[PDB]
Structures are given as C-alpha cells and as structure tokens.
Amino acid sequence: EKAKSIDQATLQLLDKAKQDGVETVWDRKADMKVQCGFGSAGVCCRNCSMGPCRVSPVPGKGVERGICGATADVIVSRNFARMVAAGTAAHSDHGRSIALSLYHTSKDGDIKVKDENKLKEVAKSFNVETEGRDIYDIAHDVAKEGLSNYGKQLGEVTLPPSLPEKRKELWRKLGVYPRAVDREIAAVMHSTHIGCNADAEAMIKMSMRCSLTDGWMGSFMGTEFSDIMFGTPHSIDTEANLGVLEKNSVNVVLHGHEPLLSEMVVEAASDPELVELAKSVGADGINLCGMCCTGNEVSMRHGIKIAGNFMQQELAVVTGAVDGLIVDVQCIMPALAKLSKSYHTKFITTSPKAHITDSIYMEFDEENPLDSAKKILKEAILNFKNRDQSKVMIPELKCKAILGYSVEEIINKLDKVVNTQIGPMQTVKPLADVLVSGVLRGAAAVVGCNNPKVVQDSAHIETIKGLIKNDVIVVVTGCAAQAAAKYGLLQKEAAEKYAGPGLATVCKLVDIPPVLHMGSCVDISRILDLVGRVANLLGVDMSDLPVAGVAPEWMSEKAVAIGTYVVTSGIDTWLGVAPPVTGGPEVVDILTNKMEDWVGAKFFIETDPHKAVEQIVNRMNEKRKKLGI
C-alpha cells in the first residue's frame, strides 16, 4: 500500500528485482511484519544471562523491574548508551586508520601529503613545530599527536580551535569533557554492565561525554587528515543516481566508508595497463561509481559519479551492469553476498574489519596500497567478459550535482561579497552577517540514513525543500546529501526553483546552490567547524545561534552518536525516526526537555517532516529573539 521510494529509477529497478525473483531490503522489512514493541521502546535488556528481561513501557502496569532490579529508565538509558558507544567506535576506527596512514606517508610513497598549507595549520593545533622542518616529519608528528587522542591515559586531549571556549568550560562544569576516544567507549561499556550504573541522568551524561570523542576528535581528525593526504575539497561538478552506470563501460562501484581504498582505486583507474585492459575486453573504459560515504569522499575530491545512497545498494546489482562491487566497512548490507549470486557481479570485500561470508575477500594491503587497488580493480575489469548485455537494465535517470563545499571553500566563496576596503577576508563573517541581519533566518544541517520505516528519500526531500523555502540555508552530508543530489537540489538553478527570497538572494550573490553538500558523515565535523567559527566570531556560544540538525530517515548507531554530539555541542536536533526510548519516561524527559538546561539544546522526535520544518523555524526564531537578532 505504501510507496517504497520517491525516486523513479529506484522504483523501476525495484520492479526488475521482483521479476528476477531476488530479495531487497524492502522485502525483508515486510517479512519482519509487526516488530517487537519491547525492543522498539527500549525496555528489553540482554546485558547478562539472568535475562532476557523485558519490563512494561507503560509505567505502573505489568512487569516493573528486571531480575537484577533495573527499572525501565535504567534499561532504556543503558541500551541508548551502547548505541552511542557503537557509533563512536565506528567513527573511531575510521579516523584511527586515517591517522595511521598519515604516519606512514613518505615523499616517494603511495600515500603523500597533498595539502601542505592545511597540515601546517593543523600542526599549530597540536603544538607541532613547522618552521624549517621537512613536511613529512611534520605530518608524522601530527599523526602521533592525533593518535594520542585515541588512547592517552594521562593529560588532556587536543580539541580543534573552532570549538568555543564557552562550550569547553560548560562541559567541564557538567562533567562531560571528553577523554581518550577508546577510553570513553570502554567507559560506557563498563557502566552498562549488570550491577553498575542504574541512573538515567548519569547514564545519558556518559553517553554525551562519549559522543564528543566522535564529532570533535574521531570524525574531526579523520576529516582533517583525509584532507591533508587526499586534498581539501573544493566546489566540483558531478552526476548522481543510478543512470551514471554505462552499459558499454566497465562499471566498478565503490561502496563503504574508509577512503584510502577508493582513493587508490581512482588512481588505479588511470594506469595505462588497466586502461588498455578494459579496452581489450571490449568496453569503452573504466566507469567508477561511488555509493554512500566512500562515494561521497571521492566525489567531493574528484567528482566521481555517485551511483546512489544506502537503500539503493541492492538495486545497483539488479541493473546487471555492476562488474565489481568493492566494499570496505560500515553499512554494507550482508544481503549483497546472496543477491550477487544471481548476477555476474563479483562482490569483493577488502577490509578484515568486515568479512562477509560467501563474498570474495581481497585484502587491501595498506603497505602497498596502489599495487593492491590495482590487483582488485583488474579482477573487476576482467569480470566484464561475463556480462550478459541482454539482461542489462540501466534507467535513463541521472541528475547533475555540485558538491565539494568544505569549510575552506565556503569561506573562499564568501570572500566574493567582502568589500576590499571594509571587512576581513578568509573569515566566516559574511555568513554571520546575513544571519545576524535576518536575511537568512538560520542554518540547518540535514544528515542521516535511509530507513524502511520511511518512504526512502521522501523525508529528506520534504525537510530540505521546506527549510530552504523559509530562507534557511541547508547543509547536507551522507545519504541525505546524496538524496538531495539525486533529486536535483545540489544545483545553482535550485535557488529560484525552491528557495525563499533571502536564500535566493544570498545564493545569487555568493554563486552557490541553496543546499551545500559538505561531504561524508565524518565530514559532519565540517559543520561543527563552521557553526563554531560563527559562534566564536559573534562572541557567543553555539547554543545561542539559530542552527539546527535534522536526521529524517536515520538508522545507524552512528546517527545516534552523531545526533547526541550535535546536541551536546549545543545544536537542536530533529529525528525523523523514533529512537527506542519511549519505554523510559525519564529518558524521554532528559532527551526532549532537561537536555536544554544542560547544554542549551535538546532532541526533537518528529516523523512528519512538514511539522518538523515548522518546529525548526519556530525554535530558530525563538533563539533569534533571545539573542536580539
């Protein structure tokens, strides 16, 4: 009865999937039928073998406490904590690999330093000397100091400069100032053990402390170091959606997250031997396509075409045109191994962090990265000989998209509206001014996943379209950004098409689209860098600005960690999918009310995007009045 998507190409292939007789993520959601209301409310605990225990989400009725004595609030808050601990760890290991790659950069090696100016500037944040030193001794000293942020047991951690000092001392008084990344993950996992913490407030506060090691450390260093090694993103053109697949080219799709592999596949797709090889098997060339975050990472830096977002990964295989599906870690549906048994596609896993049964394991040798990517790519190009062009169905649907909007590039773009003799250059002042003046009502980040509980991409598009109509500039990352890209919002033409008067004027003056694709989900750290720069420039804290974050169709534990650190940093967050918290009323009051008194923001749970847009606008105008703007 309900529509499965709002994207036509997504729907066309869904029909082919039914004809071919293959399962999709929608079909498995249906097979699940009415999902257990206990786990949907968070009032089930399995933290020890006395259980499984389930208490009633309706207070006063049914079973009240678990066998150990845990209340509903205790069970909910611990389950919520372990979600943050998981998402934190996901981004943690991500940035740890990126820092390790930076430690192994050499002058003549496969991994180099590409943005010397950024490294010199990042080195100043770690108190690493740069005057007259070799650029790789600097990079190694930066990597070492960044790695210390993951497991140091003595001393304090290094935090970015755009984090307002008001917020640091706020965290200190609240007792949520971050420690080492792995050290907090262990701390949350410790207190959630049976017979440890049994207080909702203290439990949530540990979760907020954990999430800070993600946004301002794990994800932040991951992004900063990814820019140093691969290049800081700048505005770039690309095409999005499943129509980027070419029938007469070798289609290699990069799925996953960790960017070192996809960065090396891009460089491997230009080796004359591998270029000549694709021609020898009968194709026109090598057509690199990205999906999800590793697709975002290479599109921001190299404009590689974005094949699609989370709930489309199954449908790319259904086209019958994917010769290689090269995946690393995070958000690779294990169903792909069974699905690709019905097609010539070679589904190749590469990271020992994410083995998948019945896939083809080709370990990405991080000690010979380029040679290793070539070996994996050659296997994909050879697989082109096994394509059956009669069963191929590539929908004729693709949209142009502009992305590459890093903080540096937004600042660079804003310099255009600065009078040579008046203001300062290379600052975020132009954006602060249009916010203070009121031409822009606010700025909203729209991030998040896809989720079968929501018509895929429908909540993203309605939220984004509604915010830009009310003169709220919108920045996007991850699968939401790729949902904007497919729809056609990442175009300068989208301003007069969909934006209100103020946003349309700023868009024309700055020469930008109304929706800024700021990269992958570790790249959300760019959003914090941006908002923090505006707060510092206006002498205020981040809870005082008219900013907001939205997760219209989230799913991953990464999103819970992301949403939790966005709030603790001081930014109101709207969720479009109810988290499993309804069972514990104290947990609800903490996340949706008391949070305000702690950090200056709170969570909002709204499944109607049009309602959420109202709330965001009203909350912004409320905060605007408090600030006098």
Q: Pick between residue 46 and residue 400 the one whose CB is nearest to ligand SF4.
A: 46
Subset of residues 252 to 311 that bind ligand SF4, contact rule: CB under 6 A: none
Q: State the Cα torsion 219-220-222-227 to the nearest 10°.
A: 140
Binding of residue 202 to F ion (CB under 5 A): yes
DSSP state of 289: E
DSSP state of 415: G
Binding of residue 209 to a second copy (CB under 8 A): no
Q: Pick between residue 202 and residue 425 the one whose CB is nearest to ligand SF4.
A: 202
Which of ligand SF4, F ion, Na ion, none is residue 194 near (CB under 5 to 8 Å by kind)?
Answer: ligand SF4
Which distant-in-sequence residues (6+ apart) come within 8 Å of 157 by Cβ?
A: 149, 178, 179, 180, 213, 217
Among 15, 18, 46, 280, contact with ligand SF4 (rule: CB under 6 A): 46
Quick one: which segment of 68-76, 170-178, 563-571, 606-614 binds ligand SF4 (CB under 6 A)? 68-76
Q: How many residues does the chain have?
A: 629
Note whether 211 and 565 are within 8 A (CB).
Answer: yes
Binding of residue 170 to a second copy (CB under 8 A): no
The distance of closest approach from Cβ of residue 485 to ligand SF4 in the complex, given in angstroms and rounded to an integer, is 25
Which of Na ion, a second copy, F ion, none is residue 478 near (CB under 5 to 8 Å by kind)?
Answer: none
Among 8, 18, 50, 63, contact with ligand SF4 (rule: CB under 6 A): 50
Residue matched to tokens 């372990």: 82
The distance of closest approach from Cβ of residue 205 to Na ion in the complex, given in angstroms and rounded to an integer, is 17
Mark 2-41 with x for binding to ligand SF4 (rule: CB under 6 A) and - for no binding. Answer: ----------------------------------x-xx--
Q: Pick between residue 12 and residue 349 the one whose CB is nearest to a second copy.
A: 349
Note whether 553 and 512 are within 8 A (CB).
Answer: no
Among 388, 389, 419, 628, contact with F ion (rule: CB under 5 A): 388
Q: Residues 575-602, buried b or exposed e (16+ Cβ, 10 A)?
A: bbbebbbbbbbbbbebbeeebeebbbbb
How far CA 387 is from CA of 286, 306, 319, 332, 344, in Å, comes to 15, 22, 11, 23, 6
Binding of residue 42 to ligand SF4 (CB under 6 A): no
Binding of residue 307 to a second copy (CB under 8 A): no
Supply angle C-alpha 22, 23, 27, rounded to 5: 140
203: left (phi over 0), alpha (psi -120 to 50) or beta: alpha
Among 11, 23, 26, 51, contact with ligand SF4 (rule: CB under 6 A): 51
Rounded Cα gap, residues 466 and 11, in angstroms: 24
Rounded Cα gap, residues 58 and 198, in angstroms: 19
Binding of residue 579 to a second copy (CB under 8 A): yes
Among 13, 17, 89, 518, contact with a second copy (rule: CB under 8 A): 89
Which of Na ion, ligand SF4, F ion, none is residue 425 near (CB under 5 to 8 Å by kind)?
Answer: none
Q: What are phi and psi of 529, to 5 degrees?
A: -55, -40
Binding of residue 189 to ligand SF4 (CB under 6 A): no
Binding of residue 458 to a second copy (CB under 8 A): no
Which of ligand SF4, a second copy, F ion, none is residue 408 near (CB under 5 to 8 Å by kind)?
Answer: F ion
Amino acid, single-letter form, for residue 492: K
Binding of residue 334 to a second copy (CB under 8 A): yes
The distance of closest approach from Cβ of residue 312 to a second copy in the complex, given in angstroms and rounded to an integer, is 14
Q: Residues 432-456, buried b or exposed e (16+ Cβ, 10 A)?
A: bbbbbeeebbbbbbbbbbbbbebbb
Tell me the two tokens of residue 365: 């040798």
The distance of closest approach from Cβ of residue 383 to F ion in the complex, given in angstroms and rounded to an integer, is 10
Closest among 622, 459, 573, 582 to 208, alpha carbons compared: 573
Give bridge partners of residue 444 from the DSSP assignment: 474, 548
Subset of residues 35 to 74 that bind a second copy, contact rule: CB under 8 A: 35-36, 39-40, 44, 46-54, 63, 65-71, 73-74
DSSP state of 156: P
Q: State the Cα torsion 117-123-124-129 to the nearest 10°.
A: -100
For the purposes of burial, counting CB atoms within 10 Å of the CB of 424, is it exposed (0-12), middle (13-18) or buried (19 or more)?
Answer: exposed
Which of Na ion, F ion, a second copy, none is residue 183 near (CB under 5 to 8 Å by kind)?
Answer: a second copy
Binding of residue 425 to a second copy (CB under 8 A): no
Between strands 472-476 and 360-361, the pairing is unpaired
The distance of closest approach from Cβ of residue 314 to ligand SF4 in the complex, given in angstroms and rounded to an integer, is 13
Among 17, 53, 316, 562, contact with ligand SF4 (rule: CB under 6 A): 53
Among 554, 565, 598, 603, contact with a second copy (rule: CB under 8 A): 554
Using CB under 8 A as the binding criterion, the count of chain residues that bind a second copy stands at 100
Tell me the two tokens of residue 181: 């990344």
Binding of residue 140 to F ion (CB under 5 A): no
The distance of closest approach from Cβ of residue 571 to a second copy in the complex, given in angstroms and rounded to an integer, is 21
For the purposes of burial, counting CB atoms within 10 Å of the CB of 199, is it exposed (0-12), middle (13-18) or buried (19 or more)?
Answer: middle
Contact residues: Na ion, CB under 5 A: 340
Among 11, 135, 174, 186, contact with a second copy (rule: CB under 8 A): 186
Rounded Cα gap, residues 130 and 432, in angstroms: 32
| Three-state DSSP class for residue 200 | helix
Q: Pick between residue 197 and residue 299 the one whose CB is nearest to a second copy.
A: 197
The distance of closest approach from Cβ of residue 421 to a second copy in the complex, given in angstroms and rounded to an integer, is 49
Give the residues lining the site for F ion (CB under 5 A).
Answer: 187, 202, 205, 232, 320, 343-344, 353, 388, 391, 408
Give the residues lining the site for ligand SF4 (CB under 6 A).
Answer: 36, 38-39, 44-48, 50-54, 66-68, 70, 75, 194
